[PDB]
Design an enzyme around this catalytic site. Sequence first.
Site, PDB file in Angstrom:
ATOM      1  N   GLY A  31       0.895  -1.251   0.084  1.00 51.41           N
ATOM      2  CA  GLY A  31       0.008  -0.087   0.063  1.00 51.41           C
ATOM      3  C   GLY A  31       1.000   1.261   0.114  1.00 51.41           C
ATOM      4  O   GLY A  31       1.968   1.179   0.354  1.00 51.41           O
ATOM      5  N   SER A  34      -0.146   9.365   0.892  1.00 47.05           N
ATOM      6  CA  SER A  34       0.737  10.674   1.104  1.00 47.05           C
ATOM      7  C   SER A  34       1.562  10.247   2.093  1.00 47.05           C
ATOM      8  O   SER A  34       2.577  11.009   1.866  1.00 47.05           O
ATOM      9  CB  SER A  34      -0.325  11.732   1.334  1.00 47.05           C
ATOM     10  N   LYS A  53       4.250   0.434   8.112  1.00 48.38           N
ATOM     11  CA  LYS A  53       4.198   1.692   7.642  1.00 48.38           C
ATOM     12  C   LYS A  53       5.474   2.700   7.861  1.00 48.38           C
ATOM     13  O   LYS A  53       5.949   3.183   8.793  1.00 48.38           O
ATOM     14  CB  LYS A  53       3.004   2.270   8.294  1.00 48.38           C
ATOM     15  N   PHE A 103       2.552  -2.561  12.169  1.00 45.12           N
ATOM     16  CA  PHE A 103       1.253  -3.157  12.754  1.00 45.12           C
ATOM     17  C   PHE A 103       1.045  -4.652  12.629  1.00 45.12           C
ATOM     18  O   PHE A 103       1.661  -5.095  11.630  1.00 45.12           O
ATOM     19  CB  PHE A 103       0.319  -2.175  11.900  1.00 45.12           C
ATOM     20  N   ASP A 152     -10.856  11.957  10.341  1.00 40.35           N
ATOM     21  CA  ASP A 152     -10.744  11.594   8.865  1.00 40.35           C
ATOM     22  C   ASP A 152     -11.208  10.300   8.331  1.00 40.35           C
ATOM     23  O   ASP A 152     -10.700   9.403   7.618  1.00 40.35           O
ATOM     24  CB  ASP A 152      -9.259  11.724   8.072  1.00 40.35           C
TER      25      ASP A 152
HETATM   26  C1  LIG Z   1      -3.100   5.212   6.323  1.00 38.88           C
HETATM   27  N1  LIG Z   1      -2.696   3.574   6.192  1.00 38.88           N
HETATM   28  C2  LIG Z   1      -3.076   2.952   5.076  1.00 38.88           C
HETATM   29  C3  LIG Z   1      -2.472   3.079   7.268  1.00 38.88           C
HETATM   30  N2  LIG Z   1      -2.229   3.519   8.394  1.00 38.88           N
HETATM   31  C4  LIG Z   1      -1.957   2.849   9.716  1.00 38.88           C
HETATM   32  C5  LIG Z   1      -1.921   1.534   9.458  1.00 38.88           C
HETATM   33  C6  LIG Z   1      -2.135   0.887   8.357  1.00 38.88           C
HETATM   34  C7  LIG Z   1      -2.176  -0.381   8.089  1.00 38.88           C
HETATM   35  C8  LIG Z   1      -2.050  -1.499   9.072  1.00 38.88           C
HETATM   36  N3  LIG Z   1      -1.921  -2.667   8.857  1.00 38.88           N
HETATM   37  C9  LIG Z   1      -2.068  -2.810   7.478  1.00 38.88           C
HETATM   38  N4  LIG Z   1      -2.212  -3.709   6.789  1.00 38.88           N
HETATM   39  C10 LIG Z   1      -2.299  -3.549   5.185  1.00 38.88           C
HETATM   40  C11 LIG Z   1      -2.325  -2.374   4.636  1.00 38.88           C
HETATM   41  C12 LIG Z   1      -2.332  -1.153   5.652  1.00 38.88           C
HETATM   42  C13 LIG Z   1      -2.140  -1.172   6.955  1.00 38.88           C
HETATM   43  N5  LIG Z   1      -2.309   1.620   7.205  1.00 38.88           N
END
Ligand SMILES: CN(C)c1nccc(-c2c[nH]c3ncccc23)n1
Length: 337
Positions: A31, A34, A53, A103, A152
């Site tokens: 993924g 921004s 991330k 995460f 958001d």
């Molecule tokens: C803003 N964003 C995409 C974001 N902000 C915080 C945490 C995560 C996220 C945690 N696990 C994931 N697994 C797969 C894809 C994304 C994530 N994504």
Amino acid sequence: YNDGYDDDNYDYIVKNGEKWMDRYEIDSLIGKGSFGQVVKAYDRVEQEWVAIKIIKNKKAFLNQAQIEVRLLELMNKHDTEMKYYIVHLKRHFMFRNHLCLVFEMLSYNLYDLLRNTNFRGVSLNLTRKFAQQMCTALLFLATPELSIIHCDLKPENILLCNPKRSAIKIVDFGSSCQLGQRIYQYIQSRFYRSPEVLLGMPYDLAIDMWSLGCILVEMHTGEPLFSGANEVDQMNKIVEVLGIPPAHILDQAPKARKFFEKLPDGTWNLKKYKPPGTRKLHNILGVETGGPGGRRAGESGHTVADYLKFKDLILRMLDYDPKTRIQPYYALQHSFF
Ligand SMILES: CN(C)c1nccc(-c2c[nH]c3ncccc23)n1
């Protein structure tokens, strides 16, 4: 850039199979946005896949992510069983001038799911499951030691845990704040932006409930409820469905006259769209006409009675008055659930 580690966008140049810190083997990019990038990585110490991330190497992005870290640490502290639908931050570290947040690994976001429906919407039953989890998350954010306003909420910031299942987690607390420390005047992505924010008025956790009402309609119809191209168009689209906001609100709104004008009789009208309140949610949802586009006619799980309960809950989430808009505890008690 950054001794060869970064590109001209401040992003870390991902390398498949790279080893970090004698611990993580980077697999692939999963993924981006921004903020930076999200990679799938194997945590060799804990023997599990994780999502990392990787925040951009740029101070504004770093500091946004430091806010995110602090709020996640506060939340996860108060939810050790992971039962309130907030993504779990395992740890963080600085690596090659990038702040990295580790995460749990998640699946697709709810916009991806809408695309997967060909923008025709998920069922009312699945919408209800998402709604119940989201309202439980908002109840948790409202606990006094948190008092977190996400600020958001939108389909892209709600992720499935597993592609085949309805469980979700909310992500992205970088633009969030706490009730005691409200700083921002400009907040929320436009389609999901509450009337109090559009009007320049004080705000609280109720702004997230407004966004949720917008999200849930879109999850079932496939399309944003209020798809404004700019703030004036946004307010006009809200007014098409919900009518002119109450005078007691507009009388106190710093930006009332960006959208409205006050008549001699004290009442307010729009500045020179379907007439106010005539684009009925009853018809957007297709309560009596087979659901959105008539496509749910003849399907189980989509009765008039069901739809009337959903409509009632959504209209409570879309109350113009943030003092009377339904709150998480009462949303969870609603007969829709
Ligand atoms: C803003 N964003 C995409 C974001 N902000 C915080 C945490 C995560 C996220 C945690 N696990 C994931 N697994 C797969 C894809 C994304 C994530 N994504």
